[PDB]
Amino acid sequence: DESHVTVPQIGGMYEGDISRKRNLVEYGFRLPSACDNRPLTWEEFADRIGQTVYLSATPGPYELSQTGGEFVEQVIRPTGLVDPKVVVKPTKGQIDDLIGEIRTRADADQRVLVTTLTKKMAEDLTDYLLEMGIRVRYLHSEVDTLRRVELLRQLRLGDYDVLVGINLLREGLDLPEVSLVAILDADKEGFLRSSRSLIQTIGRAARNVSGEVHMYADKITDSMREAIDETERRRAKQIAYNEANGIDPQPL
DNA sequence: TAGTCACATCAGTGATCAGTGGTTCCGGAACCACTGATCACT
């Protein structure tokens, strides 16, 4: 599962650990048998394994190369939930719209998410939002568990609505109550903001019954809009399946 | 320039106990009664 990062993790771990076995064995700490007591080189693992099945809505490049590009689809949940409605606007008009949607969601006391790129601008923007009397928090590189766990307590107690993270937010958050997310400066072509990143944000925003995505960037990256288009067409497919069942998207 | 990486222990290091070395300390005037003269008499 998540072999798209497990296999790169395998090679990266082997490389870093063999760099350590250098300066360990190469520099008189253990014998080369230490170097042997290692993660299997990716090829060695690929041999020692049996039949291989990768599990991810975003198959890895080398994974697709191994599998020939074919796969097995499972995207329509039996529940009937559908993907969010995406919107794209330029970077300008971001603070005003952000506050407006903050208040609109606070009418019903709903959640919201925000992404960012640079730490300085991220925390500056969160500071301004706090200055405008906004129930907002932010995340940085090395935040610790207590902060976001008390954030979970707060959100399930209806204290705040929005959060402002950069990268690590992408992992370890399941928020059914957010019907709107904002994606800052997706225009830049970055590894951490790749098609996998946009698909992850799409899945995040798909949690709510009528979730919504809002990416604010001057230009539109190929990955972001192709991901949005495939998301919306599979969303139409899911809606068709729902209405064929005579069942509205069912929260579960 | 960067998040994950995971294959225990000599040797301090002394606390701290928890055993050993040593502590230490009172009341003494009473109590039991016993014991060398002193006139007495001879």
Coordinates of C-alpha atoms in Angstrom, one line a residue, chain A residues 4 30 45 72 77 97 114 120 138 145 161 176 178 190 200 202 214:
Chain A
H4 CA 4.6 4.8 -4.8
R30 CA 31.9 -3.2 11.6
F45 CA 13.6 -7.3 -3.0
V72 CA -8.0 -2.4 -11.3
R77 CA -17.8 4.0 -2.8
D97 CA -12.6 35.9 -0.4
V114 CA -5.8 26.3 3.5
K120 CA 7.3 33.0 6.2
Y138 CA -1.5 27.3 11.0
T145 CA 1.1 16.1 18.0
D161 CA -13.0 26.7 11.3
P176 CA -15.5 15.1 7.4
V178 CA -14.8 20.6 5.8
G190 CA 6.9 21.5 -7.5
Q200 CA -4.7 14.2 -2.3
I202 CA -9.2 16.4 -4.0
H214 CA -10.6 26.4 -4.6

